[PDB]
Amino acid sequence: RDEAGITGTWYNQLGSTFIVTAGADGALTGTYESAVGNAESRYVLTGRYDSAPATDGSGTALGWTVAWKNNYRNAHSATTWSGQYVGGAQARINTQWLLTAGTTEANAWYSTLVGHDTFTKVK
Amino acid sequence: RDEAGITGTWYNQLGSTFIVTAGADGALTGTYESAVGNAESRYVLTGRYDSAPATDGSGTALGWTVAWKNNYRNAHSATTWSGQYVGGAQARINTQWLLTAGTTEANAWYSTLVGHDTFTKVK
Amino acid sequence: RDEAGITGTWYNQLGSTFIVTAGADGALTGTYESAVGNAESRYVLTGRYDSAPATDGSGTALGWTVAWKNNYRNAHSATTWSGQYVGGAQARINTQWLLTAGTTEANAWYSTLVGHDTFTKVK
Amino acid sequence: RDEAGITGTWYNQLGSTFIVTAGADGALTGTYESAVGNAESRYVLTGRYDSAPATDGSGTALGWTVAWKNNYRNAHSATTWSGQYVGGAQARINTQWLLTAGTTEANAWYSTLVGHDTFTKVK
Ligand SMILES: O=C(CCCC[C@@H]1SC[C@@H]2NC(=O)N[C@@H]21)NCCN(Cc1ccccn1)Cc1ccccn1
Ligand SMILES: O=C(CCCC[C@@H]1SC[C@@H]2NC(=O)N[C@@H]21)NCCN(Cc1ccccn1)Cc1ccccn1
Ligand SMILES: O=C(CCCC[C@@H]1SC[C@@H]2NC(=O)N[C@@H]21)NCCN(Cc1ccccn1)Cc1ccccn1
Ligand SMILES: O=C(CCCC[C@@H]1SC[C@@H]2NC(=O)N[C@@H]21)NCCN(Cc1ccccn1)Cc1ccccn1
Ligand SMILES: [Cu+2]
Ligand SMILES: [Cu+2]
Ligand SMILES: [Cu+2]
Ligand SMILES: [Cu+2]
Ligand SMILES: [Cu+2]
Ligand SMILES: [Cu+2]
Ligand SMILES: [Cu+2]
Ligand SMILES: [Cu+2]
């Protein structure tokens, strides 16, 4: 189904680069490079996608996580993207995301940022 | 650090069961069984955690994804949990989550549910 | 400041119509007409905005609520939009929103949808 | 219905104080005092609630907004709470919230915090 459609390099509206392989078993593996924030170079990502989506024209549900630690920096935080892949001539992955920081209990009420990223095969 | 603290069986307030192994490399692997919704038995999960958290008393950031397809059912959806592990005698994983369904474009505006789950080692 | 910039008719990407008056005291009052969902005609809205925003080029924070009851229908739900107004030749109100339904306790875990709407003065 | 049940003083898990009047017309008016963050004393709030909820045991949908400007401080931000009132001997208002700051366009990707507050009549 969308193994081929999902696998590859994607770019979001911030200029970040999402490099992913979709496995036959529903796995997502690859790397993420954020153009913004406390981040440099690539970070490991892993996630899952619906490997047998509906055939009624609906998108394909998926999600993935990055923990913001690599050999260069550690931002003590993790983002999860939850979204759907929409195939076609202008393929897209439309997501919403939650970025949680490790905090003290006193600061936990502001631990989590929320936003939305749209990924395309171009740009 | 928290490899040992995170690895194991966790339970949330809904009675769902989160079985996870935290790898030395920052990986999270395991299974999720939801007590609610269009779900039965176990589903694969994968995620990431900060394997070198701060030492100032802050929690450990992490996240993981489940795509709601297994050998029994397919709910054409995926949940990502984004949160932090808080160690101690009453250890907890405090999360917020995004559940995205595969939808048509016309229905995409209501594709995504949001909520919050707290996981404990007991119950 | 942005009393004049905010007051007026706005339209989002779904074709919904947001008619608002920004008061000198920080109040937002007006009506909302959703182009989608269990909704017809106008609904009352009320909200608040920062009536003395920063002068460093930042946007103006604001939010508002609609309860989805009017003389025609009652969808037993409420949406809150939380966002910022960005002035200029292409003025925008960029929001994220939470739509909560009245549910039984058993169904409360899926009470809340999340999304994002961008409002413009045109379309 | 819940005009009487909602009107009054509520407290959340952070120790914040939510003072609200529910009008016959679906209006919510009152003040909010946050125990945390860049806030002191009371701030105006306004919102809406379903004034004719379902009779099947479901909660009552509601939401409200605070812009974090008063005579003492201005945090250039606004929170919206979206939730439901659940009546009974242990009445509760269960919410999720979005706190948006006024930001530059470059920083807009981290403009919005998300969390969840539970309000009770005691504490
Ligand atoms: O910056 C990071 C890691 C990189 C995140 C990039 C995001 S992921 C979603 C979005 N999509 C992208 O492609 N890129 C971005 N984590 C901390 C975020 N902090 C704010 C922030 C924003 C800008 C600069 C520094 N900090 C929060 C914080 C909470 C406590 C202490 C410290 N910080
Ligand atoms: O139910 C599932 C899979 C299981 C999710 C369990 C969640 S994960 C977060 C939370 N924490 C847990 O431990 N369990 C729950 N996905 C569809 C959710 N749908 C609603 C829903 C709720 C209850 C029953 C059926 N559907 C939405 C929908 C959107 C379009 C079409 C159809 N459905
Ligand atoms: O549809 C409404 C009211 C109108 C909402 C329009 C939103 S507000 C955010 C976004 N921006 C807009 O301009 N329009 C939309 N409330 C129920 C939403 N339900 C789903 C839904 C989606 C489509 C059709 C019917 N239902 C959920 C539900 C949970 C339990 C029982 C029943 N329903
Ligand atoms: O603090 C406020 C106003 C009060 C919010 C209290 C919230 S409302 C939800 C929750 N429930 C409550 O009862 N109280 C809290 N706004 C800025 C939040 N900022 C973080 C923050 C957290 C702690 C201390 C200072 N700042 C973000 C920021 C983004 C850019 C620049 C500056 N700041
Ligand atoms: Cu930061
Ligand atoms: Cu199917
Ligand atoms: Cu469902
Ligand atoms: Cu450090
Ligand atoms: Cu509905
Ligand atoms: Cu200022
Ligand atoms: Cu702040
Ligand atoms: Cu009804």
Author numbering:
A (entry chain A), B (entry chain A), C (entry chain A), D (entry chain A): 12 to 134
Provide text from the study.
Our work utilizes biotin–streptavidin (Sav) technology to develop artificial metalloproteins (ArMs) that mimic the active sites of natural copper metalloenzymes. Our group develops artificial metalloproteins (ArMs) using biotin–streptavidin (Sav) technology to mimic natural metalloenzyme active sites to characterize otherwise elusive intermediates and study the effects of the secondary coordination sphere on metal ion(s) reactivity. This approach leverages the strong binding affinity between biotinylated metal complexes and the Sav host to confine synthetic metal cofactors within a protein scaffold. By engineering ArMs with aromatic residues within their secondary coordination spheres, we systematically investigate the influence of these residues on Cu reactivity and oxidant activation. Our results demonstrate how the inclusion of aromatic residues within the secondary coordination sphere influences the structure and reactivity of copper ArMs.
Based on the structures determined by XRD and the MS results, we sought to test whether the incorporation of a tyrosine residue at another location would lead to increase levels of non-specific protein oxidation and whether the oxidation of tyrosines in the secondary coordination sphere was influenced by their location relative to the Cu cofactor. We therefore incorporated our [CuII-biot-et-dpa] cofactor into a new variant in which K121 was substituted for a tyrosine, producing [CuII-biot-et-dpa⊂2XM-S112A-K121Y-Sav], where Y121 sits 6.7 Å from the copper center as determined by XRD. We note that despite being nearly equidistant to the Cu center as in 1, the interplay between tyrosine incorporation and N49 coordination is not observed in 3. This difference is likely because Y121 in 3 is unable to achieve the steric influence exerted by the positioning of Y112 in 1. However, comparison of the structures of 1 and 3 reveals differences in their primary coordination spheres, in which the amide residue at N49 no longer coordinates the Cu center in 3. Upon reacting with peroxide, whole-protein HR-ESI-Q-TOF MS of 3 showed oxidation levels that fell between those observed for 1 and 2. While peaks corresponding to singly and doubly oxidized species increased in relative abundance compared to those same features in 2, the base peak at 16 443.2 m/z still corresponds to the unoxidized protein, indicating that it remained the dominant species in solution. The surprising result that 3, with a tyrosine at 121, shows less modification of DF31 than 2 suggests that oxidation depends on the orientation and position of the Cu cofactor. We point out that while the oxidation of DF31 is limited in 3, the non-specific oxidation of other residues in 3 is enhanced relative to that in 2, an observation that is not yet completely understood.
